[PDB]
Amino acid sequence: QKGSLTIQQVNDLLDSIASNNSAKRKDLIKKSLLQLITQSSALEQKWLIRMIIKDLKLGVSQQTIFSVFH
DNA sequence: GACTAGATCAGAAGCAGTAGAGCATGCATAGTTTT
Protein backbone atom coordinates (compact mmCIF):
# COMPACT_ATOMS: atom_id res chain seq x y z
CA GLN A 1 0.00 0.00 0.00
CA LYS A 2 3.04 2.32 0.18
CA GLY A 3 6.01 2.83 -2.11
CA SER A 4 9.63 3.78 -1.48
CA LEU A 5 10.75 5.26 -4.82
CA THR A 6 11.71 8.81 -5.78
CA ILE A 7 11.43 10.40 -9.21
CA GLN A 8 15.18 10.16 -9.77
CA GLN A 9 15.16 6.43 -9.01
CA VAL A 10 12.32 5.82 -11.47
CA ASN A 11 14.10 7.81 -14.16
CA ASP A 12 17.28 5.81 -13.54
CA LEU A 13 15.44 2.50 -13.81
CA LEU A 14 13.69 3.56 -17.02
CA ASP A 15 17.03 4.70 -18.44
CA SER A 16 18.48 1.29 -17.59
CA ILE A 17 15.56 -0.41 -19.36
CA ALA A 18 16.04 1.69 -22.51
CA SER A 19 19.82 1.33 -22.62
CA ASN A 20 19.70 -2.43 -22.05
CA ASN A 21 17.13 -2.73 -24.82
CA SER A 22 19.60 -0.91 -27.07
CA ALA A 23 22.35 -3.35 -26.03
CA LYS A 24 20.25 -6.52 -26.46
CA ARG A 25 20.29 -7.62 -22.81
CA LYS A 26 16.91 -8.77 -21.51
CA ASP A 27 18.10 -9.97 -18.09
CA LEU A 28 18.80 -6.38 -17.06
CA ILE A 29 15.36 -5.29 -18.30
CA LYS A 30 13.84 -8.05 -16.18
CA LYS A 31 15.86 -6.97 -13.14
CA SER A 32 14.87 -3.31 -13.47
CA LEU A 33 11.19 -4.15 -13.95
CA LEU A 34 11.34 -6.49 -10.95
CA GLN A 35 12.76 -3.72 -8.77
CA LEU A 36 10.02 -1.35 -9.94
CA ILE A 37 7.34 -3.95 -9.22
CA THR A 38 8.70 -4.84 -5.79
CA GLN A 39 9.16 -1.21 -4.67
CA SER A 40 5.88 0.33 -5.86
CA SER A 41 2.15 0.36 -5.13
CA ALA A 42 -0.65 -0.57 -7.52
CA LEU A 43 -1.45 3.05 -8.42
CA GLU A 44 2.22 3.82 -9.05
CA GLN A 45 2.47 0.73 -11.25
CA LYS A 46 -0.60 1.74 -13.25
CA TRP A 47 0.94 5.14 -13.93
CA LEU A 48 4.30 3.52 -14.73
CA ILE A 49 2.59 1.29 -17.30
CA ARG A 50 0.93 4.35 -18.81
CA MET A 51 4.27 6.17 -18.97
CA ILE A 52 6.02 3.18 -20.55
CA ILE A 53 3.32 2.91 -23.22
CA LYS A 54 3.58 6.72 -23.58
CA ASP A 55 -0.14 7.43 -23.15
CA LEU A 56 -1.44 9.09 -19.98
CA LYS A 57 -4.91 10.33 -21.03
CA LEU A 58 -4.91 13.20 -18.54
CA GLY A 59 -7.53 15.12 -20.52
CA VAL A 60 -5.46 18.33 -20.44
CA SER A 61 -3.63 19.47 -23.55
CA GLN A 62 0.15 19.61 -23.72
CA GLN A 63 -0.33 23.26 -24.68
CA THR A 64 -2.20 23.85 -21.42
CA ILE A 65 0.63 22.28 -19.42
CA PHE A 66 3.19 24.44 -21.21
CA SER A 67 1.08 27.57 -20.70
CA VAL A 68 0.85 26.84 -16.98
CA PHE A 69 4.60 26.24 -16.81
CA HIS A 70 5.65 29.50 -18.48
C1' DG B 1 13.34 -3.62 -41.29
C1' DA B 2 15.18 -5.58 -37.14
C1' DC B 3 14.88 -8.62 -33.56
C1' DT B 4 12.97 -12.13 -30.21
C1' DA B 5 10.57 -16.41 -28.81
C1' DG B 6 8.69 -21.12 -29.37
C1' DA B 7 8.96 -25.59 -31.39
C1' DT B 8 11.54 -29.32 -33.38
C1' DC B 9 15.51 -32.51 -35.13
C1' DA B 10 20.09 -34.25 -34.70
C1' DG B 11 24.31 -35.30 -32.34
C1' DA B 12 26.79 -36.13 -28.14
C1' DA B 13 27.70 -37.07 -23.32
C1' DG B 14 26.40 -39.54 -19.18
C1' DC B 15 24.87 -43.67 -17.06
C1' DA B 16 23.75 -48.58 -16.58
C1' DG B 17 24.69 -53.34 -17.51
C1' DT B 18 27.18 -57.35 -19.51
C1' DA B 19 31.30 -59.58 -21.07
C1' DG B 20 36.11 -60.62 -20.96
C1' DA B 21 40.64 -60.50 -18.99
C1' DG B 22 43.71 -60.40 -15.00
C1' DC B 23 45.29 -61.18 -9.98
C1' DA B 24 45.49 -63.61 -5.48
C1' DT B 25 44.23 -68.26 -2.32
C1' DG B 26 44.11 -72.84 -1.51
C1' DC B 27 44.45 -77.46 -2.25
C1' DA B 28 44.77 -82.19 -5.09
C1' DT B 29 47.89 -84.85 -6.64
C1' DA B 30 52.10 -86.58 -7.57
C1' DG B 31 57.05 -86.59 -7.37
C1' DT B 32 61.25 -86.55 -4.90
C1' DT B 33 64.18 -86.93 -0.83
C1' DT B 34 65.17 -88.77 3.74
C1' DT B 35 65.35 -92.42 7.19
PDB file of C-alpha atoms (C1' of nucleotides) in Angstrom:
ATOM      1  CA  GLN A   1       0.000   0.000   0.000  1.00  0.00           C
ATOM      2  CA  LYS A   2       3.039   2.315   0.179  1.00  0.00           C
ATOM      3  CA  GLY A   3       6.014   2.827  -2.113  1.00  0.00           C
ATOM      4  CA  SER A   4       9.628   3.782  -1.481  1.00  0.00           C
ATOM      5  CA  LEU A   5      10.752   5.258  -4.818  1.00  0.00           C
ATOM      6  CA  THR A   6      11.707   8.806  -5.777  1.00  0.00           C
ATOM      7  CA  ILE A   7      11.428  10.398  -9.209  1.00  0.00           C
ATOM      8  CA  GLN A   8      15.181  10.158  -9.769  1.00  0.00           C
ATOM      9  CA  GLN A   9      15.155   6.429  -9.011  1.00  0.00           C
ATOM     10  CA  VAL A  10      12.317   5.820 -11.468  1.00  0.00           C
ATOM     11  CA  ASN A  11      14.102   7.808 -14.165  1.00  0.00           C
ATOM     12  CA  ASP A  12      17.284   5.814 -13.542  1.00  0.00           C
ATOM     13  CA  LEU A  13      15.435   2.497 -13.806  1.00  0.00           C
ATOM     14  CA  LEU A  14      13.690   3.555 -17.017  1.00  0.00           C
ATOM     15  CA  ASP A  15      17.034   4.699 -18.436  1.00  0.00           C
ATOM     16  CA  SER A  16      18.476   1.290 -17.594  1.00  0.00           C
ATOM     17  CA  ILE A  17      15.564  -0.408 -19.363  1.00  0.00           C
ATOM     18  CA  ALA A  18      16.039   1.686 -22.506  1.00  0.00           C
ATOM     19  CA  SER A  19      19.823   1.327 -22.617  1.00  0.00           C
ATOM     20  CA  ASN A  20      19.702  -2.427 -22.051  1.00  0.00           C
ATOM     21  CA  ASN A  21      17.128  -2.731 -24.824  1.00  0.00           C
ATOM     22  CA  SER A  22      19.598  -0.909 -27.069  1.00  0.00           C
ATOM     23  CA  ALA A  23      22.354  -3.346 -26.030  1.00  0.00           C
ATOM     24  CA  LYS A  24      20.245  -6.519 -26.463  1.00  0.00           C
ATOM     25  CA  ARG A  25      20.292  -7.621 -22.813  1.00  0.00           C
ATOM     26  CA  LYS A  26      16.910  -8.772 -21.509  1.00  0.00           C
ATOM     27  CA  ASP A  27      18.098  -9.966 -18.094  1.00  0.00           C
ATOM     28  CA  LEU A  28      18.800  -6.377 -17.056  1.00  0.00           C
ATOM     29  CA  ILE A  29      15.364  -5.289 -18.296  1.00  0.00           C
ATOM     30  CA  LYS A  30      13.842  -8.047 -16.177  1.00  0.00           C
ATOM     31  CA  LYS A  31      15.861  -6.970 -13.135  1.00  0.00           C
ATOM     32  CA  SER A  32      14.869  -3.309 -13.474  1.00  0.00           C
ATOM     33  CA  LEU A  33      11.195  -4.154 -13.946  1.00  0.00           C
ATOM     34  CA  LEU A  34      11.341  -6.492 -10.950  1.00  0.00           C
ATOM     35  CA  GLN A  35      12.762  -3.717  -8.775  1.00  0.00           C
ATOM     36  CA  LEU A  36      10.025  -1.346  -9.945  1.00  0.00           C
ATOM     37  CA  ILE A  37       7.340  -3.955  -9.222  1.00  0.00           C
ATOM     38  CA  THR A  38       8.699  -4.838  -5.787  1.00  0.00           C
ATOM     39  CA  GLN A  39       9.155  -1.208  -4.674  1.00  0.00           C
ATOM     40  CA  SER A  40       5.876   0.329  -5.862  1.00  0.00           C
ATOM     41  CA  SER A  41       2.154   0.356  -5.131  1.00  0.00           C
ATOM     42  CA  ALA A  42      -0.655  -0.566  -7.520  1.00  0.00           C
ATOM     43  CA  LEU A  43      -1.447   3.053  -8.420  1.00  0.00           C
ATOM     44  CA  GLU A  44       2.220   3.820  -9.049  1.00  0.00           C
ATOM     45  CA  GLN A  45       2.474   0.735 -11.252  1.00  0.00           C
ATOM     46  CA  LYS A  46      -0.600   1.738 -13.254  1.00  0.00           C
ATOM     47  CA  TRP A  47       0.938   5.139 -13.927  1.00  0.00           C
ATOM     48  CA  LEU A  48       4.296   3.517 -14.734  1.00  0.00           C
ATOM     49  CA  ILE A  49       2.587   1.287 -17.299  1.00  0.00           C
ATOM     50  CA  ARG A  50       0.931   4.348 -18.814  1.00  0.00           C
ATOM     51  CA  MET A  51       4.275   6.169 -18.967  1.00  0.00           C
ATOM     52  CA  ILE A  52       6.021   3.175 -20.554  1.00  0.00           C
ATOM     53  CA  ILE A  53       3.317   2.910 -23.217  1.00  0.00           C
ATOM     54  CA  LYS A  54       3.580   6.717 -23.578  1.00  0.00           C
ATOM     55  CA  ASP A  55      -0.144   7.428 -23.149  1.00  0.00           C
ATOM     56  CA  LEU A  56      -1.442   9.091 -19.982  1.00  0.00           C
ATOM     57  CA  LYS A  57      -4.905  10.335 -21.033  1.00  0.00           C
ATOM     58  CA  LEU A  58      -4.907  13.201 -18.540  1.00  0.00           C
ATOM     59  CA  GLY A  59      -7.534  15.120 -20.518  1.00  0.00           C
ATOM     60  CA  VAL A  60      -5.461  18.329 -20.435  1.00  0.00           C
ATOM     61  CA  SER A  61      -3.632  19.475 -23.548  1.00  0.00           C
ATOM     62  CA  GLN A  62       0.150  19.613 -23.718  1.00  0.00           C
ATOM     63  CA  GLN A  63      -0.332  23.259 -24.675  1.00  0.00           C
ATOM     64  CA  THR A  64      -2.201  23.851 -21.415  1.00  0.00           C
ATOM     65  CA  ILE A  65       0.633  22.280 -19.416  1.00  0.00           C
ATOM     66  CA  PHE A  66       3.190  24.441 -21.212  1.00  0.00           C
ATOM     67  CA  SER A  67       1.083  27.569 -20.704  1.00  0.00           C
ATOM     68  CA  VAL A  68       0.846  26.839 -16.980  1.00  0.00           C
ATOM     69  CA  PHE A  69       4.601  26.242 -16.805  1.00  0.00           C
ATOM     70  CA  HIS A  70       5.646  29.504 -18.480  1.00  0.00           C
TER      71      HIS A  70
ATOM     72  C1'  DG B   1      13.338  -3.619 -41.289  1.00  0.00           C
ATOM     73  C1'  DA B   2      15.184  -5.576 -37.144  1.00  0.00           C
ATOM     74  C1'  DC B   3      14.881  -8.620 -33.561  1.00  0.00           C
ATOM     75  C1'  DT B   4      12.968 -12.127 -30.205  1.00  0.00           C
ATOM     76  C1'  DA B   5      10.570 -16.408 -28.806  1.00  0.00           C
ATOM     77  C1'  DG B   6       8.687 -21.117 -29.368  1.00  0.00           C
ATOM     78  C1'  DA B   7       8.960 -25.592 -31.390  1.00  0.00           C
ATOM     79  C1'  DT B   8      11.539 -29.323 -33.377  1.00  0.00           C
ATOM     80  C1'  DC B   9      15.506 -32.515 -35.127  1.00  0.00           C
ATOM     81  C1'  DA B  10      20.086 -34.247 -34.697  1.00  0.00           C
ATOM     82  C1'  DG B  11      24.315 -35.299 -32.338  1.00  0.00           C
ATOM     83  C1'  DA B  12      26.791 -36.133 -28.144  1.00  0.00           C
ATOM     84  C1'  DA B  13      27.699 -37.069 -23.323  1.00  0.00           C
ATOM     85  C1'  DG B  14      26.402 -39.543 -19.184  1.00  0.00           C
ATOM     86  C1'  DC B  15      24.873 -43.670 -17.056  1.00  0.00           C
ATOM     87  C1'  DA B  16      23.753 -48.583 -16.581  1.00  0.00           C
ATOM     88  C1'  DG B  17      24.688 -53.339 -17.509  1.00  0.00           C
ATOM     89  C1'  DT B  18      27.178 -57.349 -19.506  1.00  0.00           C
ATOM     90  C1'  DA B  19      31.304 -59.580 -21.069  1.00  0.00           C
ATOM     91  C1'  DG B  20      36.107 -60.622 -20.957  1.00  0.00           C
ATOM     92  C1'  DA B  21      40.639 -60.500 -18.992  1.00  0.00           C
ATOM     93  C1'  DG B  22      43.714 -60.402 -14.999  1.00  0.00           C
ATOM     94  C1'  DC B  23      45.286 -61.183  -9.983  1.00  0.00           C
ATOM     95  C1'  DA B  24      45.486 -63.610  -5.485  1.00  0.00           C
ATOM     96  C1'  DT B  25      44.227 -68.258  -2.316  1.00  0.00           C
ATOM     97  C1'  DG B  26      44.108 -72.836  -1.509  1.00  0.00           C
ATOM     98  C1'  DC B  27      44.448 -77.464  -2.254  1.00  0.00           C
ATOM     99  C1'  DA B  28      44.773 -82.187  -5.092  1.00  0.00           C
ATOM    100  C1'  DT B  29      47.886 -84.848  -6.644  1.00  0.00           C
ATOM    101  C1'  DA B  30      52.104 -86.580  -7.571  1.00  0.00           C
ATOM    102  C1'  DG B  31      57.050 -86.591  -7.366  1.00  0.00           C
ATOM    103  C1'  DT B  32      61.254 -86.548  -4.898  1.00  0.00           C
ATOM    104  C1'  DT B  33      64.180 -86.932  -0.829  1.00  0.00           C
ATOM    105  C1'  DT B  34      65.170 -88.773   3.742  1.00  0.00           C
ATOM    106  C1'  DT B  35      65.351 -92.416   7.194  1.00  0.00           C
TER     107       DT B  35
END
